[PDB]
Write a protein that binds this ligand. Structure first.
Ligand SMILES: [Os+3]
Ligand SMILES: [Os+3]
Ligand SMILES: [Os+3]
Ligand SMILES: [Os+3]
Ligand SMILES: [Os+3]
Length: 1388
């Protein structure tokens, strides 16, 4: 203990020696002194404190001179010592409890306390705590006489004025609740006010005090009743003989001690209402009997604090019913009616004590009316009481401002909760009350009312809080606000403007009359009440309802509770409240509300009006921008068209120069800066509003079109460098995304929620205008100049201190798995929100250079792979498992989605990182990457780390899940419920609008009451089951889009890995076999189902097969033997896939390239002729079906398909002949003639010069003529070719008939032309030779009909960019043609 005392002694001596970095020190130490007190108090409560420490502690109090904050810290420790050694509850010997009675009470034993009032408080406590011990002897009658004497003298010495001063100075909320201004603050105070220091008191220290003050209050009431009943008669009768001296008001101060004690704590206040026979409940009966006007107030200040709970408040309400009279409602309402006549004629004036008594009455009314429903339902409609009329009449007459406020808080307390009936009734009182006093004029009287109520802080803040509550719907805010938030008839008698007269007042206060206010704490609370009003008006506007009625099948009034959709837009304040936000003064008030001292804001409380006045000002700017598009388009033209029909008009408050809310905050450059500096203050809900406003500011075409153009380069960017905060707020965001997270608080934590709000800001800012440097670039640490990034040396980025690196750092530390508790879905979403930023930052040309550079230095590709987990069946997400009864319903679904998107973003980087390496960067990286993709990582070298293989990360597909085979609601079934929110391209949905429609049919049937109540509950379920069905189909559709997107990343990853790394060695030859081992079970499984995924898998198989370009070890053979095994069952599935024609031409074009190479390179000593036989009989096993597909593909719109189809046929005929001298009988050629392919083939030769005019259509025809030649080699082939009139097609073409920017030298264009003739000449040659003399007449007619051309060609052959080579590559084509005609003539 004495160490604790000496520790506190050192703090006070430091703090007093320091007053004779500076402010935060006092803040730091004062709190440390406040903790040691709470810890010492705990120690005394444990019976380990000793009688010795008590004698020393009392000595410190007897010496203590200055009444300060340090003294208050020791009050709970004092009452702990007293309750220990003094009370019987404490285990203190009676002789020892008597022993210290003299040490405290006797006086004249060093009892010249440096603070005489303090010693009076110490003495009063022990007596109250010790007299109860003598309950259950020596000198009882004398002791009690001694007790009451030294107790009464202590009260006059200033005891209760000290205990009350501590209770009042202690629980000092640094913001002034206007509803309880001046309450309990009218009693005289001989105590000197605490010094000017801003030293607060812990939210706990206040509580610990009010616990001991309950023990003090409980002690005096239970142990010293007669002392209180000696004080009732002393001052009550002395009030009549000596009314002027202000006789001892200690009993009043005692009731305020009770008020401060039980305030906020209804658990303790129940001891006053639990047992009516207890001393505490008997006390309320006792104090309420008589009504000394100041003593009544002190009693009502006690009840207001004895009703913080609905249970305590209901009891207090019953206490004033009485159903020797106590104080009752009957008595209160009589005086409320007795003084309303002393004003609305006494002359118009009231006594201060009488006026105060009324305030304590209207304050008790409000409190009991808000906390208890019974009290509200009673007071609001009782005739013997008649509350509404008297308080409304009292407000007409001349009264003090504070009293007129308390009336408005009573009306608010009556409207804090309400029905649609009590709202119309209240508005009938308010209408008449505002229309006339009850000529001065009906509406001109309404002007006088607002000018009064908005005159001072006390009323204006109070009256606006009443107008705020009147617009909160009966069903509760955030309901279906389909009805107007007030009666349509309101004002239709006179002004016809509904609420607008009240709106134009709230903005008149907020924009013009806030300037009359001077106290900053009052200016905040007023602006907070004004902004709370604007919010209530913008939220109750159902914009989803307006777009629906203006766009699709829904009723204007048959459906909604309002009498019309046009009436809804007219009467609702949204029409007018929006117009006000376009006003220059209102906006300049919104900025100056936000603009505040940062250190004063950061050193404040998160609940103080200083913080919330800024939070609420932001919330208005956000909500303004959200509801702006609906306003300017669907709302404003409806008002300017109705006020032209009705002819009515009111003053325009908006600015015609403002075409959008942006135009107002364009000029206020201080706004974007202040929004950042407030994140550095450590107030969460304030931060989230600031960041979400930076999005809508830095994601709007206007404000991003006013920072760049002026000369100025970028205004908002340099504005962060103006005072030098651009780096200090960027440093704060770093500590925010580095901050710790609590698994218990989980998805809704201050740290976690601030992270997502930053990652949503940096992304939302980058996604817009991604090719120009934005705010998000500068805050990330990139040095931002025009259209160019860069790192400033000795800057937070170059030294790896930037925020950007903190996004990497948080990534390489996440553990999104809690050992079979599942992948916490809130945490995998954190990973995605970070990655998608980095993704945008390696796709844009600005960042890819700087980012891919820094991602290399940091080993980013490795840390992600080191932490990536394998997808598995029994791998739960959020505790939920895939393939559950309904997995696509919980927030675990969207967590699996985000994980697939996160994986794809990793493969995409590993791909780009595997291309930036191949060009030059040493094989140390490609080796590291490649082994990291097989699972061999050597960071520390002690041993190689085992990471799952890139083929184990092929875990994002199991073809049996059938996500696409869960049904969608039939579009007519939705249309019959008039649901037209469905989005297309499969079908997607808008859950929100759809659920909005179902809520409007619910109120349509609920209010109509035609069929109820059970049918309602069944419909209430089917709606919840429909939107439950819709959410599954749009999340499944959202999963397939994310799974396919991932397949392209894993697929495209293997491609970049095949082409960079050459495969000739066994360990590599073993890798590609491992790859082929993983894609085949999948591609084989659903090459029939659908194409989109089969295309990506069939594409890695192609590129793979074309990489085995073809002295060995005994292991490499067993490898290749397993590759030839897989390549066969690949060739098989490609054959079955083609024969079915299951995929699009672009996919089968990929199938034909796989078969072509398997027939070209693989199959082509006698073990190869066997391979030809097996491969051949496998093709022709499918009959003409397989050939039909390849044939009609050779004549399709797809140019790449018909080329691969024609080339595949060329290889099919080639391998059947190698299987079967040169004239034989082929089954394939006989099939083609049957399918009429050779017919349409020869007939497609007419436009040979049109198609042949390196060109894509050039190579397709080159494959066509290579096939014709293949056919004409055999006898039957040359027959089927010629039987289709071959020579006829060669004549109608006219190719045998002796250049505008086509990008080749001319010399190469001719050899292509000749090469066409080279092919055509060989085709005719093979045809004449194979058939026989049957076409020697045709072979003769062919030359006689084209003679001369042969003569020129037969003589042309006889006789350095590329020209020498081109002439060689041409003159040889003439040597081939001269030989083509030479072998034709001699064979003819
Ligand atoms: Os429609
Ligand atoms: Os004006
Ligand atoms: Os289940
Ligand atoms: Os590339
Ligand atoms: Os959704």
């Amino acid at each position: 203990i004495p160490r604790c005392m000496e520790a506190m002694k050192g703090v006070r001596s430091m703090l007093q020696c320091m007053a004779d970095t500076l402010d935060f020190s006092r803040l730091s130490l004062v709190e440390q002194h406040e903790c040691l007190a709470s810890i010492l108090h705990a120690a005394v409560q444990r019976h380990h404190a000793t009688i010795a420490d008590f004698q020393d502690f009392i000595k410190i109090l007897r010496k203590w001179d200055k009444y300060d904050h340090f003294l208050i810290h020791l009050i709970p420790v004092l009452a702990a010592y007293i309750t220990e050694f003094g009370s019987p509850e404490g285990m203190g010997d009676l002789q020892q409890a008597r022993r210290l009675n003299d040490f405290i009470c006797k006086g004249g034993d060093e009892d010249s306390w440096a603070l005489p009032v303090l010693g009076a408080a110490v003495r009063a406590w022990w007596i109250a705590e010790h007299n109860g011990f003598y309950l259950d002897g020596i000198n009882l009658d004398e002791e009690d006489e001694q007790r009451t004497k030294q107790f009464l003298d202590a009260l006059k010495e200033g005891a209760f004025d000290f205990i009350l001063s501590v209770a009042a100075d202690c629980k000092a909320q640094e913001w002034q609740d206007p509803s309880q201004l001046g309450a309990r603050q009218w009693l005289q105070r001989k105590i000197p006010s605490l010094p000017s220091e801003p030293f607060p008191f812990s939210h706990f220290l206040q509580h610990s005090l009010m616990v001991h003050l309950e023990g003090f209050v409980d002690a005096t009431i239970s142990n010293l009743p007669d002392v209180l009943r000696k004080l009732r008669t002393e001052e009550d009768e002395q009030r009549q003989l000596r009314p002027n001296h202000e006789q001892d008001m200690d009993l009043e101060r005692f009731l305020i001690i009770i008020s401060y004690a039980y305030e906020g704590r209804p658990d303790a206040a129940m001891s006053f209402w639990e047992d009516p026979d207890s001393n505490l409940a008997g006390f309320l009966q006792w104090a309420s009997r008589r009504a000394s006007t100041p003593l009544v107030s002190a009693f009502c200040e006690m009840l207001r604090c004895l009703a913080d709970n609905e249970e305590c408040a209901t009891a207090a309400h019953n206490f004033l019913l009485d159903e020797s009279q106590s104080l009752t409602w009957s008595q209160i309402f009589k005086e409320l009616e007795y003084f309303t006549t002393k004003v609305c004629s006494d002359p118009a004036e009231i006594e201060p004590e009488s006026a105060l008594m009324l305030e304590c009455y209207l304050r008790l009314i409000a409190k009991l009316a808000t906390e208890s429903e019974i009290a509200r339902k009673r007071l609001i409609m009782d005739e013997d009481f008649n509350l509404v009329d008297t308080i409304l009449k009292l407000s007409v007459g001349v009264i003090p401002h504070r009293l007129r406020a308390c009336i408005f808080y009573v009306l608010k307390a009556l409207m804090i909760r309400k029905t649609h009936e009590e709202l119309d009734a209240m508005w009938r009182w308010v209408e008449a009350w505002m229309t006339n006093p009850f000529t001065p004029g009906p509406q001109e009287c309404m002007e006088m009312m607002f000018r009064e109520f908005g005159t001072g802080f006390e009323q204006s803040n109070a009256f606006i809080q009443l107008l705020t509550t009147l617009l909160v719907p009966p069903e509760g805010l955030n309901s279906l606000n389909d009805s107007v938030p007030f009666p349509e008839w309101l004002g239709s008698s006179i002004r016809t403007l509904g609420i607008e007269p009240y709106v134009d007042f709230v903005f008149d206060v907020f924009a013009n009359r806030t300037k009359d206010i001077s106290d900053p704490s009052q200016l905040r609370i007023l602006r907070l009440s004004c902004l709370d009003f604007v919010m209530v008006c913008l939220v109750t506007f159902n914009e989803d309802l307006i777009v629906l009625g203006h766009e699709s099948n829904i009723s204007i009034d048959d459906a909604m509770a309002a009498t019309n959709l046009a009436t809804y837009v007219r009467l609702h304040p949204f029409s007018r409240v929006m117009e006000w936000l376009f006003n220059e003064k209102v906006i300049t008030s919104l900025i100056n509300t936000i603009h505040q001292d940062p250190i004063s804001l950061g050193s404040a409380s998160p609940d103080s009006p200083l913080v919330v006045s800024i939070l609420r000002a932001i919330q208005v700017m956000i909500k303004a921008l959200e509801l702006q598009e609906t306003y300017l388009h669907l709302v404003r033209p409806e008002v300017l068209r109705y006020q032209g029909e009705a002819g009515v008009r009111r003053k325009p408050v908006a600015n015609a120069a403002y075409s959008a809310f942006e135009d107002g905050i364009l000029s206020h450059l201080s706004l974007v800066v202040d929004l950042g500096k407030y994140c550095n203050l450590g107030h969460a809900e304030l931060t989230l509003a600031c960041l979400k406003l930076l999005e809508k500011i830095s994601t709007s075409s206007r404000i991003l079109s006013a920072w760049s153009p002026d000369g100025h380069r970028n205004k908002a960017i340099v504005q962060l460098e103006r005072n030098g905060e651009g780096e200090t707020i960027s440093a704060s965001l770093s500590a925010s995304i580095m901050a710790t997270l609590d698994p218990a608080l989980a998805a809704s934590g201050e740290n976690y929620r601030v992270k997502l709000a930053i990652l949503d800001f940096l992304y939302a800012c980058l996604r817009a205008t991604p090719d120009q440097p934005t705010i998000a670039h500068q805050l990330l640490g990139f040095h931002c100049e025009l259209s160019k990034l860069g790192i400033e040396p000795k800057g937070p980025f170059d030294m790896q201190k930037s925020l950007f690196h903190s996004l990497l750092n948080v990534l390489i530390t996440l553990t999104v798995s809690e050992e079979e508790q599942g992948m916490r879905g809130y945490l995998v979403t954190l990973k995605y929100r970070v990655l998608r930023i980095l993704q945008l930052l390696w796709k844009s040309p600005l960042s890819a250079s700087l980012v891919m550079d820094e991602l290399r230095a940091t080993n980013f590709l490795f840390h992600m792979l080191l932490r990536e987990v394998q997808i598995q069946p029994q791998l739960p997400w959020d505790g939920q498992l895939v393939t559950g009864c309904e997995f696509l319903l919980s927030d675990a679904s969207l967590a699996y989605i985000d994980y697939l998107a996160s994986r794809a973003a990793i493969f995409e980087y590993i791909g780009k990182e595997l291309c930036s390496v191949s060009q030059n960067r040493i094989p140390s990286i490609k080796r590291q990457i490649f082994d990291a993709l097989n699972g061999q990582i050597f960071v520390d070298e002690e041993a190689p780390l085992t990471i799952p293989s890139i083929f184990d990360f092929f875990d994002f597909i199991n073809t049996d899940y059938k996500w696409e085979e869960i049904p969608s609601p039939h579009f007519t079934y939705l249309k019959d419920l008039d649901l037209g929110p469905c989005i297309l391209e499969g079908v997607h949905y808008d859950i929100r609008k759809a659920q909005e429609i179902l809520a409007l049919k619910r109120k349509e049937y609920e209010h109509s009451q035609l069929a109820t109540p059970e049918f309602l509950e069944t419909v209430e379920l089917e709606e919840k089951v429909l939107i439950e069905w819709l959410t599954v189909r749009n999340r499944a559709n959202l999963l397939l889009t994310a799974r396919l997107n991932l397949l392209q990343a894993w697929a495209n990853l293997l491609l970049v890995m095949i082409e960079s790394n050459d495969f000739k060695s066994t360990p590599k030859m073993a890798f590609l076999l491992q790859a082929l081992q993983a894609i085949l079970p999948t591609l084989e499984a659903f090459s029939s189902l659908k194409s989109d995924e089969a295309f990506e898998l069939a594409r890695v198989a192609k590129v793979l097969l074309w990489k085995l370009d073809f002295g060995l070890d005994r292991e490499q053979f067993t490898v290749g033997n397993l590759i030839g095994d897989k390549l066969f069952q690949l060739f098989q599935l490609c054959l079955s896939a083609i024969s079915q024609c299951s995929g699009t031409p672009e996919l089968r074009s990929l199938y034909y390239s796989i078969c072509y190479r398997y027939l070209t390179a693989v199959v082509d000593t006698r073990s190869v002729t066997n391979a030809r036989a097996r491969t051949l009989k496998a093709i022709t096993l499918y009959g003409d079906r397989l050939l039909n597909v390849i044939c009609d593909d050779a004549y399709g719109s797809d140019t790449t398909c018909q080329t691969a189809a024609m080339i595949l046929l060329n290889a099919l005929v080639h391998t059947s002949r190698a299987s079967s001298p040169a004239d034989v009988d082929c089954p394939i050629i006989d099939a083609l003639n049957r399918l009429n392919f050779i017919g349409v083939l020869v007939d497609s030769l007419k436009e040979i010069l049109n198609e042949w005019l390196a060109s894509p259509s050039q190579q397709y025809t080159s494959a066509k003529l290579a096939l014709l030649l293949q056919l004409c080699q055999t006898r039957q082939g040359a027959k089927y070719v010629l039987q289709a009139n071959l020579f006829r097609a060669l004549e109608q073409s006219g190719v045998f008939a002796a250049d505008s920017e086509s990008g080749v030298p001319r010399v190469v264009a001719l050899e292509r032309h000749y090469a066409l003739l080279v092919a055509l000449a060989r085709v005719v040659g093979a045809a004449v030779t194979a058939r026989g003399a049957h076409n020697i007449v045709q072979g003769r007619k062919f030359l006689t009909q084209h003679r001369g051309l042969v003569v020129h060609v037969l003589k042309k052959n006889a006789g350095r960019r590329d020209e020498i080579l081109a002439q060689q590559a041409l003159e040889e084509r003439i040597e081939e043609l001269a030989e083509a005609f030479m072998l034709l003539i001699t064979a003819t």
